């Protein structure tokens, strides 16, 4: 590529995409925590026999 003098190459991070990805990742993490909690309430129920 060619060099442009007097200019800087800024970052390529789009904030809207990052925010929506953060939201969906939070929901997925909560779902995984929920199934973790279910496996225990199952192990605890088996223990209380």
């Amino acid at each position: 590529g060619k060099l442009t003098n007097g200019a800087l190459e800024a970052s390529n991070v789009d904030l809207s995409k990052e925010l929506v990805n953060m939201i969906v990742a939070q929901r997925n993490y909560q779902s995984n925590a929920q199934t973790i909690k279910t496996q225990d309430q199952i192990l605890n129920t088996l223990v209380n026999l």
Binding site: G1, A7, E9
Partner: protein, 50 residues
């Protein structure tokens, strides 16, 4: 699940005028070549030079 890897989106970003003569922007492909105090070779897209 297993994390196969972490990539880096090597697409050209914004070009912003700065008004200083020592900043260079690389459109399209290319990497600036640097050497540290040890002598290793490095590559960087940041054109903020001094």
């Amino acid at each position: 699940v297993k994390v196969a890897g972490i990539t880096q989106d090597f697409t050209d970003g914004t070009t912003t005028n700065t008004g200083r003569g020592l900043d260079v922007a690389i459109s399209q492909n290319g990497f600036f070549r640097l050497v540290d105090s040890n002598g290793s070779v490095f590559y960087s897209r940041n054109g903020q030079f001094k």
